[PDB]
Symmetry: C5
């Protein structure tokens, strides 16, 4: 009857929308010098799980929020029964190649590979990860604690193709595990522009810097 149809319709609209987007001019070839893209990064640090002073590797668990905007993902909500956003497999759309620059093990993914696309063409994608990176935990057992840092950025695109930005320099600590072995003294996330004599193009990274110590 009445209510069952309205659900069948909204389903048809969504499937039509997804079809119109993923087939009509197929998956986007990535950014270029002529069509650059800005990716916004933010970290929500959940836990420093482990600090290994025999190999100088530290393990973090965090959510990496990524946001970007494509014209080719735009639609008029009016043409698709008032749909303003949708969930889709990350495999269905282009995603940026943001990588830790000093990891020592492949990143492990803790959350579904699904993204949210909005009618204005913005995508949001928020992978939870466990990362092992190069870090000397020396001083972790003192009042001053240890300090570690890891750069995140595109692996293959320069700043002429992908720019990075953060909404804030403060890493979100409001979900930090209250009973972690390590307590967080501060955690910052900072856009850096790197330059190199050989090369006209700039390189961009977000520098994640964590100061931590053993819980008392």
């Amino acid at each position: 009857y009445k209510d069952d149809d309205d659900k069948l319709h909204s389903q048809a609209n969504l499937m039509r929308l997804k079809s119109d987007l993923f087939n009509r001019s197929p998956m986007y070839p990535g950014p270029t010098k002529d069509d650059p893209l800005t990716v916004t990064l933010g970290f929500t640090l959940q836990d420093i799980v482990k600090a290994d002073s025999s190999t100088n590797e530290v393990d973090l668990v965090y959510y990496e929020q990524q946001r970007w905007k494509l014209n080719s993902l735009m639609w008029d909500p009016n043409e698709y029964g008032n749909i303003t956003d949708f969930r889709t497999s990350a495999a269905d759309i282009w995603t940026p190649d943001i990588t830790a620059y000093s990891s020592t093990r492949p990143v492990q993914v803790l959350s579904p590979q699904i993204a949210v696309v909005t009618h204005d063409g913005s995508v949001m994608f928020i992978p939870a990860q466990r990362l092992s990176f190069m870090c000397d935990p020396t001083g972790v057992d003192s009042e001053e604690g240890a300090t570690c840092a890891v750069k995140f950025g595109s692996w293959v695109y320069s700043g002429f193709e992908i720019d990075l930005k953060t909404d804030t320099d403060q890493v979100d600590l409001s979900s930090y595990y209250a009973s972690s072995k390590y307590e967080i003294l501060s955690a910052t996330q900072t856009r850096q522009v790197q330059h190199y004599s050989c090369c006209p193009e700039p390189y961009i990274d977000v520098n994640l810097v964590v100061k931590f110590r053993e819980r008392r």
Copy 2:
């Protein structure tokens, strides 16, 4: 008698065909879905006090209902349900919110679909999650908690419920290193600052201690 079997097979293959490779984009605000969760806690395998991670093995029972998976048993030679690869159908993205390692899957990825459109899927998992086992060697024991919920859908798209707050303990390993004092599973609604959309999770809370002498 060999024919009756060939027929029931044909009906099942036709049904599966009519459902999958002829006819789901997931739930929406306009077409929301309710997932029922239940845990059967098999074993606390390991409690690592140097990293504060605990390892659990459990069965996660998931249940939901799709109109698009309905059929009339009469049209398909009285078939009322069938077994199918979980890869063949949409499944919910229920995730542990505080895991520290990817979940490991211990059982086949197979689901049961019923003529009324309900699906049941029951993955066995091993999970490492954030937990301070301090006190696990005392009479009071330790307490740990982990939220499970959709990763990408708010409570306008996916609602969660439990049939019961008591975690099923009747398959708990009698000789585990740890004994279970209590295990509850509770639907929580977090509201927020800004936002109008409520978020739903199921909070798994386990009280446990070292098994005695």
Copy 3:
């Protein structure tokens, strides 16, 4: 050289006729199946008394029979059986009920199909399961048990049977850290109050101790 090209053609035709033409959806209440299980225990590799997990390595022999896999050897140049990738045919979802890590596969995923419709498939596996090794260092030794059965089919869909209650120990590693006192494999039938179907498993029970 022709004799060989012919027998090849016949085999490829047979496989074609069976797989790419005529479609097995698994067993049902109306078309139930019997799987025969047997274990050959190769080694107890490791017993961890800090987590109560034991690691076994064994061969799990699985056998079943499908009408849809039958052929007349006469129509296919006297072929009576063939080897095929396990990915090419339906296989049962036999699982350990108390494993603590995903099972690791030690052998090729290949099965043997016979003209009468029977399949035999014998994965070698390493399994970690829930087990208290307490007493392993005593004359009496430890005892551990693990049920194996279908994960999603009740006994109305898949019955289980064993040819024998004795686990095959004739390939047990003579120099394992642990010696086997006994190892049995037993069909069990179970009801639960949720459901009206019988449920069926094969219970593998191993008694072992530290090698002297």
Copy 4:
């Protein structure tokens, strides 16, 4: 110049096409048996665990066989005598360690060399954990361990095995390994079991080793 390269490319792609289509090999049979030649090049005994009695080896396993269905006349394909191809593109034998304790790990690309006469050569580098008591490793006499390699599903009526030599190649053994090799042999064995009327073949790899001084 540039054309003679485009041509040799076209010839190779045509050859590969002509082979992997036009009669797309079902494996050996009683009527069409096959001989696989095995050889090991032992690179390193990495680890010897006396608490679980497992030893880790790294070696190259050379495999060689010959299929009529892989033959071609070099004259018909611009004088191509051999080519490199993904192992996934052709049938390969199911040679397994009979007493491994972990899945084999593959250290090298899964690529094989096919020659106009129909012969294939495939040389996977592997790390293997297998059952072995390292007792005595720390004495002048050292330890001895053994592992059989053979087909998992084919009897000796379908696959015969042979070695070109009984001596395992030791010329790439890591000079600074924790363990030095006293001897390493590879031997064809023919077995009979009473389950069965057909013979079974393996190559038994026997290693005698001790701690480096």
Copy 5:
């Protein structure tokens, strides 16, 4: 300038289409169509040295470069595109392997490559590698020395030649706070002939001298 962007996208998708179809799949190099791969290492960190198994763990970037005629295009025909990024699975890549690894290589970076209009490809996987190495002496002033050959697994030097732009491993990204400090790191092209075989074999030999940080 919404149209400009749609056009440059169309051009790129057309180019990628024209390349990955029409004469589909380059079949790899041959005696008649040999290829030169250029290797370079950027050593990031010696992570671990295990003296109980004689395995050392390295983390490095392996730069690989080669050139295919079949990847060439005229930038003029494709709206002035001079290069593009593509999934490494979309194109042939060389089978460069460590000859004395003890565990499968672990990949730390996206499997993406850069193709340029002149037909050259660049691909720079970050890896963690465990290889056979006796760290004896690491705790002395002289330190330890280890070596690992890298080369094609299945192609002789008649099919794949290797070369380096420089003998010096790039150390400018070496982790300042690694447990181990680098005394020197060289990367050297070697040519081998054998008795088994009239073909020449080429490998690049990575040699690292290192010791415990003080």
